[PDB]
Amino acid sequence: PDPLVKFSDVTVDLAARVIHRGEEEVHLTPIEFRLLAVLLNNAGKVLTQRQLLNQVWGPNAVEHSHYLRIYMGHLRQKLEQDPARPRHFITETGIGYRFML
């Protein structure tokens, strides 16, 4: 299963909770990391906003859909070449999100 995930200039050790780009250490927030993980562990699958709020928080569903948008933004800001044009952290409009690689 291998807890060492690599996608662009980013390498993420899921076990240690550490991330390098590309590479020196990018520092994530504990919340931003549980979301990265969930996303990394569902690579390529399209996940609903409720699915994501469930897996990151649990009773923070669903009346807290905005936190998910705010933390996707943070993830893009830190990990994406162009936060405005994500290549890995992809939105499925009206549904949820999809992570590539």
Residue numbers in the entry: 5 to 105
Quote the study on this structure:
Synthesis of hetero-oligomeric KdpFABC, a P-type ATPase, is controlled by a widely distributed TCS consisting of the transmembrane histidine kinase KdpD and its cognate RR, KdpE. Phosphorylated KdpE (KdpE∼P) interacts as a cis-acting element in the promoter region, resulting in transcription of the kdpFABC operon. The interactions of the DBD of KdpE (KdpEDBD) with DNA are most likely mediated by a wHTH motif. Focusing on the DNA binding domain, this study describes the comprehensive characterization of interactions between KdpEDBD and its recognition site (kdpFABCBS) by: identifying the two 6 bp direct DNA repeats; determining the X-ray structure of KdpEDBD and identifying residues involved in DNA binding by mutagenesis; and quantitative analysis of DNA protein interactions by analytical ultracentrifugation establishing equal affinity binding to half-sites with no detectable cooperativity within the limits of the data.
To determine the structure of KdpEDBD, X-ray diffraction data was collected up to 2.5 Å resolution. The KdpEDBD structure was solved by molecular replacement method and refined to an R-work of 23.6% and R-free of 28.4%. Overall, the structure of KdpDDBD resembles that of other members of the OmpR/PhoB family of proteins: It has a central three-helix core (α6-α7-α8) bookended by two β-sheets containing four and two strands at the N- and C-termini, respectively. The C-terminal pair of anti-parallel β-strands (β11–β12) that form a β-hairpin structure constitutes the wing of the wHTH motif. The 15-residue-long, solvent exposed helix α8 of KdpE contains five positively charged residues that can potentially interact with DNA. Likewise, the α-helical and β-stand elements of KdpEDBD superpose well onto PhoB in DNA bound conformation with deviations restricted to loops connecting α7-α8 and α8 to the β-hairpin structure (the DNA corresponds to the PhoB recognition sequence). In the superposed structure, the steric clashes between DNA backbone and Y191 of KdpE indicates that the α8 recognition helix may have a different tilt angle with respect to the major groove to accommodate the larger side chain of KdpE Y191 (as compared to T194 of PhoB). The corresponding residue in KdpE is the β-branched residue T217, the branch point sits close to the peptide backbone, which makes it unlikely to penetrate the minor groove formed by T-rich sequences between the S1 and S2 half-sites of kdpFABCBS. Mutant KdpEDBD were incapable of binding to DNA in EMSA, even at a 1∶8 molar ratio of DNA to protein, which underscores the importance of these residues in stabilizing DNA-protein interactions.
